[PDB]
Amino acid sequence: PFPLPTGYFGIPLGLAALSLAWFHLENLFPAARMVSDVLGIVASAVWILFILMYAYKLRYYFEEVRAEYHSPVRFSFIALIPITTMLVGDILYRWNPLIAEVLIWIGTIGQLLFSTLRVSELWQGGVFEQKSTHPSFYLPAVAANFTSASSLALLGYHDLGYLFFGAGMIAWIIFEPVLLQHLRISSLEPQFRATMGIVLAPAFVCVSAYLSINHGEVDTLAKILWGYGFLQLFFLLRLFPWIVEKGLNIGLWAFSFGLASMANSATAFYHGNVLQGVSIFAFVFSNVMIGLLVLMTIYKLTKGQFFL
Amino acid sequence: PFPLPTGYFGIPLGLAALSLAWFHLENLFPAARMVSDVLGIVASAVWILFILMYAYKLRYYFEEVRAEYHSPVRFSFIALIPITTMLVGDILYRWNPLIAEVLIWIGTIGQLLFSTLRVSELWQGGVFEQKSTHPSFYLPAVAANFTSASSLALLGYHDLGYLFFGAGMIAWIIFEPVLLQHLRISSLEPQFRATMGIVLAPAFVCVSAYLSINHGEVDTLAKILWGYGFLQLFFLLRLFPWIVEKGLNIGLWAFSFGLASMANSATAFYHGNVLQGVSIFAFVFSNVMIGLLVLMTIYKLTKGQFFL
Amino acid sequence: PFPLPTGYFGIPLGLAALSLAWFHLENLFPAARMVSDVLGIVASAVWILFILMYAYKLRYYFEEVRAEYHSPVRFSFIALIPITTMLVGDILYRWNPLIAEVLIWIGTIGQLLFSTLRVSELWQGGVFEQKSTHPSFYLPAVAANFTSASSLALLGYHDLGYLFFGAGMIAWIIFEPVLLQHLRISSLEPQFRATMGIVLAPAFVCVSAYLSINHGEVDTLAKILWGYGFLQLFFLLRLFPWIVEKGLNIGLWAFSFGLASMANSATAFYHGNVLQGVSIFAFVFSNVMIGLLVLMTIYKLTKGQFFL
Ligand SMILES: CCCCCCCCO[C@@H]1O[C@H](CO)[C@@H](O)[C@H](O)[C@H]1O
Ligand SMILES: CCCCCCCCO[C@@H]1O[C@H](CO)[C@@H](O)[C@H](O)[C@H]1O
Ligand SMILES: CCCCCCCCO[C@@H]1O[C@H](CO)[C@@H](O)[C@H](O)[C@H]1O
Ligand SMILES: CCCCCCCCO[C@@H]1O[C@H](CO)[C@@H](O)[C@H](O)[C@H]1O
Ligand SMILES: CCCCCCCCO[C@@H]1O[C@H](CO)[C@@H](O)[C@H](O)[C@H]1O
Ligand SMILES: CCCCCCCCO[C@@H]1O[C@H](CO)[C@@H](O)[C@H](O)[C@H]1O
Ligand SMILES: CCCCCCCCO[C@@H]1O[C@H](CO)[C@@H](O)[C@H](O)[C@H]1O
Ligand SMILES: CCCCCCCCO[C@@H]1O[C@H](CO)[C@@H](O)[C@H](O)[C@H]1O
Ligand SMILES: CCCCCCCCO[C@@H]1O[C@H](CO)[C@@H](O)[C@H](O)[C@H]1O
Ligand SMILES: CCCCCCCCO[C@@H]1O[C@H](CO)[C@@H](O)[C@H](O)[C@H]1O
Ligand SMILES: CCCCCCCCO[C@@H]1O[C@H](CO)[C@@H](O)[C@H](O)[C@H]1O
Ligand SMILES: CCCCCCCCO[C@@H]1O[C@H](CO)[C@@H](O)[C@H](O)[C@H]1O
Ligand SMILES: CCCCCCCCO[C@@H]1O[C@H](CO)[C@@H](O)[C@H](O)[C@H]1O
Ligand SMILES: CCCCCCCCO[C@@H]1O[C@H](CO)[C@@H](O)[C@H](O)[C@H]1O
Ligand SMILES: CCCCCCCCO[C@@H]1O[C@H](CO)[C@@H](O)[C@H](O)[C@H]1O
Numbered sequence: 007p008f009p010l011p012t013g014y015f016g017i018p019l020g021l022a023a024l025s026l027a028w029f030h031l032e033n034l035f036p037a038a039r040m041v042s043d044v045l046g047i048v049a050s051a052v053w054i055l056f057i058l059m060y061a062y063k064l065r066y067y068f069e070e071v072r073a074e075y076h077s078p079v080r081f082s083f084i085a086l087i088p089i090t091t092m093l094v095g096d097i098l099y100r101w102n103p104l105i106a107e108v109l110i111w112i113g114t115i116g117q118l119l120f121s122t123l124r125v126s127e128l129w130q131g132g133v134f135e136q137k138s139t140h141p142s143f144y145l146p147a148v149a150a151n152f153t154s155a156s157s158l159a160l161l162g163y164h165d166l167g168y169l170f171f172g173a174g175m176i177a178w179i180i181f182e183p184v185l186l187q188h189l190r191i192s193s194l195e196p197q198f199r200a201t202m203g204i205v206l207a208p209a210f211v212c213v214s215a216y217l218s219i220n221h222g223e224v225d226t227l228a229k230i231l232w233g234y235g236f237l238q239l240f241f242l243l244r245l246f247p248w249i250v251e252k253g254l255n256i257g258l259w260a261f262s263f264g265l266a267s268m269a270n271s272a273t274a275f276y277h278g279n280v281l282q283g284v285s286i287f288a289f290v291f292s293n294v295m296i297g298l299l300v301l302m303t304i305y306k307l308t309k310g311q312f313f314l
Numbered sequence: 315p316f317p318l319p320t321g322y323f324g325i326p327l328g329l330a331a332l333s334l335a336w337f338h339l340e341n342l343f344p345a346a347r348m349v350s351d352v353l354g355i356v357a358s359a360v361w362i363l364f365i366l367m368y369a370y371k372l373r374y375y376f377e378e379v380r381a382e383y384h385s386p387v388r389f390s391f392i393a394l395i396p397i398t399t400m401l402v403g404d405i406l407y408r409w410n411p412l413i414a415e416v417l418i419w420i421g422t423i424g425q426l427l428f429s430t431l432r433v434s435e436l437w438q439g440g441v442f443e444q445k446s447t448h449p450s451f452y453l454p455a456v457a458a459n460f461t462s463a464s465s466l467a468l469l470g471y472h473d474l475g476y477l478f479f480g481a482g483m484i485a486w487i488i489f490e491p492v493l494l495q496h497l498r499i500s501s502l503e504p505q506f507r508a509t510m511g512i513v514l515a516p517a518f519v520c521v522s523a524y525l526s527i528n529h530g531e532v533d534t535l536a537k538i539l540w541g542y543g544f545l546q547l548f549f550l551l552r553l554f555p556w557i558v559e560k561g562l563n564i565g566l567w568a569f570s571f572g573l574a575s576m577a578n579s580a581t582a583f584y585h586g587n588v589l590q591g592v593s594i595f596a597f598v599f600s601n602v603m604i605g606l607l608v609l610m611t612i613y614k615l616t617k618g619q620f621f622l
Numbered sequence: 623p624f625p626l627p628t629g630y631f632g633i634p635l636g637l638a639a640l641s642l643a644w645f646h647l648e649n650l651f652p653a654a655r656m657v658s659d660v661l662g663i664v665a666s667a668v669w670i671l672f673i674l675m676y677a678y679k680l681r682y683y684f685e686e687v688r689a690e691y692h693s694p695v696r697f698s699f700i701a702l703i704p705i706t707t708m709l710v711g712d713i714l715y716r717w718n719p720l721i722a723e724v725l726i727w728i729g730t731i732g733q734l735l736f737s738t739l740r741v742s743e744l745w746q747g748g749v750f751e752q753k754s755t756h757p758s759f760y761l762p763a764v765a766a767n768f769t770s771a772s773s774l775a776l777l778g779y780h781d782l783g784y785l786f787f788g789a790g791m792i793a794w795i796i797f798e799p800v801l802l803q804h805l806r807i808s809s810l811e812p813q814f815r816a817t818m819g820i821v822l823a824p825a826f827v828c829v830s831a832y833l834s835i836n837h838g839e840v841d842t843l844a845k846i847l848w849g850y851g852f853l854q855l856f857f858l859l860r861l862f863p864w865i866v867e868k869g870l871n872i873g874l875w876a877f878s879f880g881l882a883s884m885a886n887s888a889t890a891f892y893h894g895n896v897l898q899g900v901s902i903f904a905f906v907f908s909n910v911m912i913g914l915l916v917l918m919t920i921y922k923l924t925k926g927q928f929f930l
Binding site for chain 2: 078118121122123125126127128129130131132134135136138139151165166168169170171172173175176177179180181182183184220
């Protein structure tokens with residue numbers, strides 16, 4: 007027995023998001039559906055396992071959960087649980103809309119309860135410190151709301167989806183200023199540096215959720231978001247040697263949410279005949295990088311250095 | 315004699331804004347007009363009294379005014395004066411558009427002169443400190459511009475209204491990042507905590523002003539704003555026991571601007587047949603809470619603990 | 623011989639931008655074309671000279687360039703080089719679209735390489751300090767992307783232009799919060815104060831680029847941007863005596879980018895019959911102020927206090 011590190015939920019998260027990206031190509035290229043289904047089954051199976059492991063953690067390692075929850079930094083990774091639950095719901099919708107809808111509402115109520123309890127509590131002061139200003143804060147604050155937005159739109163609740171979308175989008179622009187100033191001043195320690203990959207996520211997760219709610223219309227807002235997303239991509243590419251200066255590690259799955267959302271949004275840009283060449287590049291690049299993450303993970307697994 | 319605490323202008327402000335919310339229901343439910351007129355007369359009467367008291371303060375307690383004006387924290391409450399003046403103008407428009415227009419321009423020129431003189435002066439450095447980063451800064455920086463926007467639109471100056479709207483909206487997104495980071499790090503002292511209610515205001519005041527200028531069209535922007543507004547509501551509800559930990563007090567009128575603007579925007583969402591159930595909840599909730607503020611205020615009055 | 627101070631590129635930048643503003647009036651008032659052509663030739667000639675001087679600096683004063691490049695404050699002025707290159711390209715387009723397109727791509731690739739190398743590197747921490755939070759950061763982070771956006775739109779690449787536009791716009795809203803908080807707390811030393819003029823630029827450069835890409839449609843976004851732009855103008859006017867408290871100097875060309883972009887955007891508001899009176903005021907004001915900058919510069923030149 008061992009307590010599951012909560013950040014491992016980033017693995018089914020990235021795979022699930024990538025399943026959904028391929029799903030959106032089925033009308034252009036039918037074989038995409040099989041790729042999507044395989045990714046989606048693997049993501050769902052991994053999610054089931056990790057949920058069961060986390061249930062074990064809650065039952066037998068509760069003080070570990072309590073400590074992560076109260077931490078002004080580590081609490082954020084708990085948001086991966088409802089986020090992945092919703093994405094698995096979105097996958098399962100293709101086979102069973104009833105079960106999908108249950109997972110989606112569980113994830114939505116869960117994430118909103120979580121942020122309402124913990125994100126707001128930080129405003130009491132004295133616990134969160136300047137050094138707590140980490141990219142992981144995007145998970146409960148931003149990513150969870152975007153995921154609710156897109157999932158609720160899937161279920162047909164577009165106007166409710168826009169409320170969650172707005173919560174996420176404005177929360178993003180309200181947090182990022184202080185994050186980037188912090189990064190400029192304070193060197194993020196190597197042990198946290200893989201989480202720089204989460205910096206890729208906001209614009210791409212945002213535009214993917216937006217396009218899910220607005221019927222795939224590639225409009226001025228969507229183009230604006232893509233532009234900032236690619237700026238951040240270029241910055242993170244330049245920074246990649248620094249990010250991995252102490253070595254390649256499993257934390258690099260942090261990048262997968264943004265990469266998968268880049269792939270998803272690319273399918274919509276392509277459908278809309280906007281920047282098709284860029285879209286092809288983005289889709290291929292993101293799949294190659296996630297493919298590398300999978301290969302590195304299988305490698306770590308086949309040597310027993312996966313989870314503590 | 316006593317010098318009027320400037321923050322008391324929040325009382326006619328909240329009542330006036332609530333009058334305007336009910337005014338906007340008259341076409342759906344005719345009895346709303348009487349509720350609106352009663353609220354509007356009470357707000358106007360209280361505003362007259364407080365204006366006269368503040369004129370007395372300027373004449374006989376000028377050094378108190380000077381000190382509040384030069385304070386990098388207390389100056390903000392002075393913006394309540396032109397804000398309330400404009401809202402009373404908006405009320406009076408139903409009876410006398412000429413007098414309304416005079417009040418609206420006085421409030422608009424006044425607030426813009428005030429911010430231009432004092433908000434900009436802060437950029438000289440050395441007076442404002444990190445600890446000065448308070449929710450009250452929204453009043454001169456954000457709320458005053460939104461109120462000009464909506465008031466000018468009432469008078470038919472829609473394009474000028476959009477300029478004030480943009481000034482307010484961008485000023486809001488430019489300030490809030492540093493406010494929330496400050497709240498996270500530094501525990502706001504109990505004596506200032508009721509001003510947390512001002513954190514509710516921006517998104518709702520914003521969308522109410524937007525809907526006033528754009529002919530009540532409930533569009534993507536409006537939905538986005540409502541979503542972030544409700545996020546903040548949920549956060550502030552969770553925080554409410556901490557906000558009042560040292561007891562219930564008259565400062566809780568800080569919440570009334572956001573609550574009244576929630577009510578106002580709800581009437582437009584309802585008219586537009588967008589999220590009608592949420593709109594009903596929002597309208598009823600905000601009225602109940604302001605009703606509680608009024609009851610608590612009458613209580614304080616009937617015991618002589620109103621103004622110093 | 624002497625090493626050219628890099629900030630002098632602000633002179634052809636302001637003149638070039640002003641040429642483009644007058645160009646956009648030719649369809650309303652034909653004589654505007656001659657004014658535009660004169661400004662454009664002067665800007666281009668000054669740019670050629672300064673480029674040659676900077677090439678000399680790279681060849682014979684390379685360690686000076688290295689030091690400015692690695693500085694977390696001084697690096698930003700290097701972005702003036704590709705920005706001016708693109709604006710000169712935009713001017714030359716009226717005479718030779720081939721040469722214009724070459725300059726535009728050189729400036730675009732150059733600025734994007736520059737930011738990708740240097741703006742991202744700051745996120746490694748430990749070099750940039752709180753005191754490095756200066757208005758000049760807008761140049762590589764914001765202004766360069768807006769200039770690419772408008773230049774690429776000129777060439778017919780509207781969707782690519784929107785990507786650069788979005789990168790600039792979101793980068794602006796992400797930086798400004800921390801800049802204004804810094805200005806509030808820390809008094810910017812007189813030697814840097816003329817750079818306060820760069821604070822005028824973002825909203826106006828933004829709306830000018832937006833109107834260049836969206837076919838001159840003066841819409842809600844454009845009006846919103848103008849409103850915040852004028853707020854900042856009013857603030858900077860009030861601050862002007864403090865800005866120049868140690869005397870008038872050549873650094874005041876910092877204001878010219880925002881002033882010229884105010885003039886440019888005014889032509890589009892006027893064409894669109896939106897706020898025509900404000901547009902006339904803005905156009906005349908900005909030209910008078912740049913005219914004053916030119917007169918003060920000729921004065922300094924005719925006395926040998928231009929460049930070190
Ligand atoms: C899409 C986001 C995936 C995030 C995966 C990266 C984190 C996986 O591991 C996480 O790393 C941390 C830093 O050492 C710890 O603080 C966390 O509790 C942890 O589980
Ligand atoms: C995934 C869900 C994580 C839930 C962990 C909930 C932790 C709440 O734990 C809290 O710690 C408090 C001390 O501050 C005490 O009230 C109690 O120990 C408990 O309420
Ligand atoms: C992701 C699934 C939803 C998360 C449920 C977390 C429940 C948290 O538990 C709550 O924690 C509070 C502190 O913030 C404690 O003080 C409360 O007493 C407790 O009810
Ligand atoms: C960071 C926020 C950027 C917001 C951009 C909103 C741009 C809206 O601009 C509008 O976009 C709509 C769809 O493209 C249409 O009205 C028009 O094409 C355009 O007027
Ligand atoms: C990111 C979205 C990826 C979409 C993959 C598209 C790859 C197809 O490639 C394209 O096929 C077209 C017709 O089908 C050909 O006309 C084009 O020349 C070719 O580039
Ligand atoms: C809508 C905003 C209404 C604000 C009302 C709350 C403030 C009323 O009182 C205010 O409280 C302060 C804090 O103790 C003082 O600093 C102020 O000058 C004061 O008048
Ligand atoms: C509601 C209006 C409030 C107006 C108060 C104006 C206060 C200006 O007071 C200023 O204090 C300065 C010291 O800094 C001195 O110039 C003078 O005392 C005065 O100009
Ligand atoms: C709400 C009504 C409008 C407010 C008018 C306030 C007038 C402020 O008064 C001004 O204060 C300046 C400092 O910022 C002083 O230095 C000036 O000398 C003085 O004219
Ligand atoms: C924080 C800023 C959010 C800006 C959101 C702008 C969204 C505009 O998006 C557009 O909205 C318009 C009205 O809904 C219409 O063009 C379309 O429905 C949509 O394209
Ligand atoms: C926030 C705005 C509040 C609007 C109050 C509406 C309350 C009316 O209630 C509604 O009446 C409808 C017809 O009039 C009925 O058909 C609906 O079932 C009922 O909910
Ligand atoms: C539109 C922007 C024009 C900027 C021109 C102003 C700067 C010109 O000079 C600049 O001033 C600085 C401050 O002393 C130095 O740090 C720079 O390297 C310098 O060249
Ligand atoms: C306008 C273009 C400015 C280019 C200046 C490039 C400066 C790169 O200079 C770098 O300094 C490093 C020390 O940190 C060493 O690698 C080398 O000296 C060099 O690579
Ligand atoms: C404006 C014209 C484009 C600018 C080109 C600048 C080239 C910078 O030069 C680069 O600087 C890096 C540091 O950030 C060095 O470490 C690299 O080795 C070097 O290639
Ligand atoms: C800081 C960001 C402000 C974004 C404002 C977006 C406002 C879009 O609002 C929309 O604007 C479009 C053009 O005016 C049209 O759809 C409509 O007129 C309006 O619905
Ligand atoms: C900022 C853009 C400046 C545009 C300059 C316009 C100046 C023209 O001035 C205008 O001429 C009109 C007809 O041509 C007359 O009908 C108007 O009364 C007059 O104001």
